[PDB]
Write a protein that binds this ligand. Structure first.
Ligand SMILES: Nc1ncnc2c1ncn2[C@@H]1O[C@H](COP(=O)(O)OP(=O)(O)NP(=O)(O)O)[C@@H](O)[C@H]1O
Ligand SMILES: Nc1ncnc2c1ncn2[C@@H]1O[C@H](COP(=O)(O)OP(=O)(O)NP(=O)(O)O)[C@@H](O)[C@H]1O
Ligand SMILES: [Mg+2]
Ligand SMILES: [Mg+2]
Ligand SMILES: [Mg+2]
Ligand SMILES: [Mg+2]
Lengths: 258, 258
């Protein structure tokens, strides 16, 4: 008669946002739908949502004058201290005695900004997309392995207005609803946070900040960091961010346990 | 008069493969050339070689009927044992008590092959591109953080001839010279190795192998794994694989220390 909590949980795994007693028939129907969804992907486009979003974001920023960076994921532990992360400090995945999995893209991008200032014309515009890692207790809006986009500009035109304009163009391009709000944190400021309801899509900063001196930066700058899995969650109306992650359990938000 | 070893080393950092006393003038010339190279990239294409190669490889395999996978980089340690890696075992970067950085894409792809067999028509064709990690003593042809491509097919048409044909089409597409040779290893076989001179570009396997049973696989299959940094090294004639890596020291093989 009434579905159990465990049965409802099983059906929820197989339910997709656009879907509109006995359990076995409900399960059979959804299994059929999800198999057909995977079959359609396989027959036609064959692209993974996370990969495809990375490619779309890459095109957006390249076309707008930003240099594509691919920097190390395993970074020196000293970069954490140098970012002012003292006792986030408890969220770091340490590897060996001298390295960690990067929890953010900032330190590598600081180094690129400094180095490229010796070669490139003002303003210097760069971005990176790639894996980042944090130990998290939360499951709904957080992953321990996620994908960040960070873009930044240094030199001329590094105004709050320009930053808000890039953010607005970017999210209107992707078709993601948002509002920009004031907030603060230990590492940076004073940030602008880009929100979708109560979900943070991005934290953005208008420099300079005193942290810059440690990285050999003495020019104005602006930048923002976005989680790609959060963008996908909002775009595809996933109830849990696990549907948007690098995963063996979901493919393009479709359960692989069929 | 004569350049010192240290001076020659400095000039070699700034020398690019296509380049054709006192040290200060030689250094000044090369600095100028390398700055202009970065300026040209920034003015025109703005793509990173590693990112661009990933995108090109993605297009090749998608167009040939392979499903794009994005699976976890941090994987359970049990996957290592289950791959038959017992005491490579000393090359694994362990994280926490239960996880490691994946040294290869095989285990995740085995799981995808098994899972997708319940949904997709025969043959099942999949590929993944992404970071892999191994502790290495060698610096010239090895990185500790590298990027793998692995493709595989399971079911019908899983012949050595078909495998060699995919490999041949792929490398002729990229414009990379190669020969396919017989070899062997502890994990798989009996492999075919794809060589560029004495450099291994890929190891390839024609299944079934007895390892399959552990992963719930009982069908014929073929697959190959390629290092993207090795492909770039060969394509761009880099003397050291560090020029092709995720790096803060090189961008598209150009020194960032200018
Ligand atoms: N654990 C995570 N899982 C998924 N996305 C994340 C995670 N941590 C950060 N992000 C994304 O990266 C962006 C910038 O990083 P940051 O501002 O450091 O995150 P944060 O303030 O810790 N987010 P939250 O923990 O929800 O308050 C965030 O706005 C998110 O979109
Ligand atoms: N440390 C590394 N750095 C760069 N590429 C690598 C590394 N290890 C493996 N690869 C690439 O991944 C491919 C398949 O992996 P695998 O066959 O396990 O490597 P391998 O036999 O250990 N190579 P080698 O150590 O040179 O004999 C290789 O053919 C390389 O192109
Ligand atoms: Mg957080
Ligand atoms: Mg924040
Ligand atoms: Mg090896
Ligand atoms: Mg090999």
């Amino acid at each position: 008669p009434a579905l159990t909590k465990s049965q409802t949980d099983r059906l929820e795994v197989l339910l997709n946002p656009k879907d509109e007693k006995p359990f076995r028939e409900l399960e059979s129907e959804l299994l059929s739908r999800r198999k057909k969804d995977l079959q359609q992907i396989y027959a036609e486009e064959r692209e993974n949502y996370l990969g495809k979003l990375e490619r779309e974001i890459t095109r957006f920023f390249v076309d707008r004058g930003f240099l594509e960076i691919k920097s190390p994921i395993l970074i020196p532990l000293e970069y954490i201290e140098r970012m002012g992360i003292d006792n986030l400090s408890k969220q770091i995945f340490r590897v060996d005695k001298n390295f960690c999995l990067r929890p953010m893209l900032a330190p590598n991008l600081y180094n690129y900004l400094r180095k490229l200032d010796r070669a490139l014309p003002d303003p210097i515009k760069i971005f990176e997309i790639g894996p980042c890692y944090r130990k998290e207790s939360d499951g709904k809006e957080h992953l321990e392995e996620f994908t960040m986009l960070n873009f930044c500009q240094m030199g001329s035109g590094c105004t709050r207005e320009n930053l808000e304009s890039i953010i607005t163009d970017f999210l209107n391009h992707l078709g993601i609803d948002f509002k920009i709000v004031g907030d603060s944190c230990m590492v940076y400021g004073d940030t602008l946070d880009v929100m979708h309801g109560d979900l943070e899509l991005s934290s953005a900063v208008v420099g300079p900040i005193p942290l810059d001196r440690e990285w050999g930066i003495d020019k104005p700058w602006i930048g923002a960091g976005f989680g790609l899995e959060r963008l996908l969650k909002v775009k595809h109306d996933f109830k849990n961010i696990k549907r948007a992650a690098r995963s063996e359990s979901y493919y393009n938000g479709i359960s692989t346990n069929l």
